[PDB]
Design a protein around this ligand. Structure first.
Ligand SMILES: [Ca+2]
Ligand SMILES: [Ca+2]
Ligand SMILES: [Cl-]
Ligand SMILES: [Mg+2]
Lengths: 175, 131, 177, 131
């Protein structure tokens, strides 16, 4: 490890059709080092992203005390408009499905490339933005380079509201 | 006395998550303004070990954002086998106090935060009374 | 028999499951977005409003104002892909989670559609899961075209019945007031 | 002044968005409290009452079950081609809802924008005023 002084953990639903190559995006983000750890740039903080590809999500979901999903990485395939559509539906009921309606669903949209036989990136960036979502295009053809950005993005978004809540706590208890 | 306190040998040894800024030790310094905070998901747990295996008359916690909590004892001197003591659903806001008069011998006490009201939670004081 | 219809009821049905399980065909077989069926032995016709996720029928609905959740669904998977079955189960759970009104049961139907994967589907067990979750289960095998209807008719009938329920409850409530 | 919604003063529903011959729109203007019109499914749902003449309306009043948000719109022209909003009301968990107004109308559109359940009923519609 670096000089890691805090390890935070974060359940991230990784949703999107089977044929958008979720496995690849995760495994490469995962394998890349050699549960997906990333340390937040310019900190001694490491964040372990618990990546729930949709039999995993289900296991989680029917466990006792299960407490919803509030972080998500939505993946689609530039090659299939319909894969994009699915992301949007997912997204909306993930927002609906939250036990706590006062915690915003934090998500990231990713454009991928299933190397196997159409979406408008154009429109996707716009939608993303309109819904306040970071948007990351992988499809370009860097399999390997920036698979990380989404995960790092989401992990950072999580980091930050940790720090938020933690300060809030120090506020609430002196003395 | 209260063997929770660092000074009556109180010592946490198997917390499931930590930030050096809010270490388990913050639970047994007897102050109300310091705390231990969880770093993410649930459940989370930590294991307090007292100087000797003692009789516990009353257990008591000071927390923020905890919803369901469970406590377990271990009277052996290695934390091999734990046995449930209680379980409590809590309520809203932003400090919780809890009192439990109990009558058990314990050497280790495990506290599990099974679920919270938010994404994170804190424990500020842990007190273990008995002789 | 039909167009001597005295009541038309309408019902939003999410039709979910992977792109490659042939939902379109299922919806096409069934109709050739509104799927009428008249409930057997009644003058009642039910229009099923079929919201294929992809798309984009469902998402459009979802972000409209006053949108009020989905409480009827048809879950489709492909016997060839165990993973497509998995997906149905997750869907199902958060459709239950996503309901605005938690006091209205999600009413769903599970459908097996017809490559094969290393881990195939035990329709014995699929049937088992379905049953354990109190879901009608319909296997789309016999060939394409015959019984695409059963699921839709099933769901439409499940809907019909609690209409009649509610409607009697109303007559109850205003004879008093 | 009369209740111009009453079927006995020319009151007539012409453009309901859903119907069951067992609970026809007419059930809203017979003045009884035990008959009703019921929706057959989704939301929103609407229906358009037309009064004998374009009159000055002062009390509008509805009797309903299961209605949560309701909106009402006027049209003073003698064809329902342009409607203008009158009000809008969120309701609660047999609901009677009375509103005082001063408008000229010939048609009155009622929209059930959302319900507390899957279905809803309107039992009475009353429109008071003169001219
Ligand atoms: Ca303290
Ligand atoms: Ca009546
Ligand atoms: Cl994949
Ligand atoms: Mg298979």
């Amino acid at each position: 490890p670096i000089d890691i002084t805090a390890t935070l953990r974060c359940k991230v639903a990784v949703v999107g059709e089977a044929t958008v190559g979720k496995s690849a995006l995760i495994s490469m983000f995962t394998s890349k080092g050699s549960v997906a750890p990333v340390t937040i740039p310019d900190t001694t903080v490491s964040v372990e992203l618990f990546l729930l590809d949709t039999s995993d999500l289900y296991k989680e979901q029917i466990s006792q005390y299960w407490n919803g999903v509030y972080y998500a990485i939505l993946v689609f395939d530039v090659s299939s408009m319909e894969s994009f559509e699915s992301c949007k539906a997912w997204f909306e009921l993930l927002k609906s499905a939250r036990p706590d309606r006062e915690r915003p669903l934090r998500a990231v949209l990713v454009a991928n490339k299933t190397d196997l036989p159409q979406v408008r990136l154009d429109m996707a960036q716009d939608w993303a933005t309109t819904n306040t979502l970071d948007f990351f295009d992988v499809s370009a053809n860097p399999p390997g380079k920036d698979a990380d950005a989404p995960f790092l993005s989401i992990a950072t978004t999580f980091y930050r509201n940790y720090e938020d809540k933690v300060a809030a706590f120090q506020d609430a208890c002196r003395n | 006395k209260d063997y929770a306190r660092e000074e009556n040998g109180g010592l946490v040894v198997m917390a499931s998550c930590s930030d050096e800024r809010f270490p388990p030790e913050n639970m047994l310094d007897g102050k109300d303004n310091t705390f231990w905070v969880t770093t993410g998901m649930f459940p989370q747990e930590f294991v307090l070990r007292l100087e000797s295996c003692i009789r516990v008359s009353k257990i008591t916690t000071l927390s923020l954002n905890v919803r369901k909590l469970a406590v377990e004892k271990c009277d052996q001197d290695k934390p091999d086998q734990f046995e449930k003591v209680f379980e409590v659903e809590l309520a809203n806001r932003g400090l919780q106090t809890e009192v439990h008069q109990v009558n058990i011998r314990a050497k280790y006490l495990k506290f599990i935060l099974l679920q919270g009201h938010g994404e994170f939670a804190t424990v500020n004081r842990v007190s273990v009374v008995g002789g």
